Paper text:
During structural characterization of HR1HR2 bundles by high-resolution cryo-electron microscopy (cryo-EM), we observed the formation of a well-folded N-terminal region (residues 1159–1179) of HR2 in an extended conformation, outside the original range used for previous peptide studies. Based on this observation, we further extended the N-terminal region, beginning at residue 1157, and determined the cryo-EM structure of this extended HR1HR2 complex. Nearly all additional residues at the N-terminal region of HR2 are well ordered and form an extended conformation. The additional N-terminal residues of the HR2 fragment interact with the three HR1 α-helices. Moreover, the densities for residues 1164–1167 are also improved compared with the previous reconstruction. Residues V1164 and L1166 form hydrophobic interactions with the groove of the HR1 bundle. In addition, the backbone carbonyl oxygen and amide nitrogen atoms of residue G1167 form hydrogen bonds with the sidechain atoms of residue N969 of HR1. The N-terminal extension of HR2 interacts with HR1 in the postfusion HR1HR2 bundle in an extended conformation. In contrast, the Omicron variant has three mutations in the HR1 region—Q954H, N969K, and L981F—and all located at the interface between HR1 and the N-terminal extension of HR2, possibly explaining the somewhat weaker inhibition activity.
Severe acute respiratory syndrome coronavirus 2 (SARS-CoV-2) infection requires fusion of viral and host membranes, mediated by the viral spike glycoprotein (S). Following host receptor binding and proteolytic activation, trimeric S mediates virus entry by formation of the so-called HR1HR2 six-helix bundle that pulls together the host and virus membranes. In the case of SARS-CoV-2, peptides derived from the heptad repeat 2 (HR2) region of virus spike (S) protein show promising inhibition of viral entry. HR2-based peptide inhibitors presumably promote bundle formation together with the heptad repeat 1 (HR1) region of S, precluding some or all of the intrinsic HR2 regions from binding to the HR1 regions and thus locking S into an extended, prehairpin fusion intermediate that precludes viral entry.
Residue numbers in the entry:
A (entry chain D), B (entry chain F), C (entry chain E): 1159 to 1200
D (entry chain C), E (entry chain B), F (entry chain A): 918 to 988
The structure:
Amino acid sequence: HTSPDVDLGDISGINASVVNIQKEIDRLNEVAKNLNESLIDL
Amino acid sequence: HTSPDVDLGDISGINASVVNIQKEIDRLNEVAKNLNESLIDL
Amino acid sequence: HTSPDVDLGDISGINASVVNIQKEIDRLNEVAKNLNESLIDL
Amino acid sequence: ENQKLIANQFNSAIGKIQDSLSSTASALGKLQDVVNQNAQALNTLVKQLSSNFGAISSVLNDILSRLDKVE
Amino acid sequence: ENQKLIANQFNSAIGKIQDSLSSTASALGKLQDVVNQNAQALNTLVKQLSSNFGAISSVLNDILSRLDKVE
Amino acid sequence: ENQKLIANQFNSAIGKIQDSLSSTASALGKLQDVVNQNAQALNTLVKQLSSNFGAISSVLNDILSRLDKVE
């Protein structure tokens, strides 16, 4: 008599990426601050 | 004879946060509507 | 003697939606390109 | 004449910026909806998996107890 | 002279707004890519877990049947 | 007089666009934070599930070996 080995499906390869948009947020805030230098003072 | 108790790892602490940016979407839409009050009528 | 059938909870219904904002990204890039046609050349 | 040109260019730019702001708001709304749906999906998955692992734990302890009684 | 100042300030503002719109488009594209990748990851996880739980169910029913035959 | 009107409308529009850019930056920051938190949650879930499935595999092979010894 014998018994087989139960091999379960591997899920370690499933990975979730991370987003890095801090450059774009910093640029948006920088432009929002720099638009004060574009105000018209007649 | 005895048999141990199989304690499986707890995963209940894993939680996924929710985002609440409805204030920012509402502000964007409000500004898109209010920019009509900034049109130049010579 | 008998043994019951162990029915495990079904999780196949759990689904993750996908986002499709390519129209909005394309519109943003199109406006960023078209704003050159709004520059003032006195 | 230059004033009319300035006004026309400014109105065109404001219209295009309004379009861009509407597009940004729509995109942020869609992203919020999808992120929240995937968050609810992950939470439902964790809850159902907790239930399933509790069931497997109970069944496995029962099987171990039966084996202990047999041997 | 005031017209030239208005035109220069308007052109500077339009350039900065173009930069901001490009940044917003890039950020929205990256967010879309990452959200869709995590969605595919969660779906793959649910599929693989369904397979694994089916396998565990089959094995557990087999073990229960063996125990029933023994006892 | 028309120059003052142009300047006032331009300053108002620039203020509103600054508000819109700040709102977009805040929304993108919140979306980034939540997407990254859900990504870490999914990764932690995959790691814990790998551990749990390894444990279940070991226990099931042990039970199968015990049954083989019995029968």
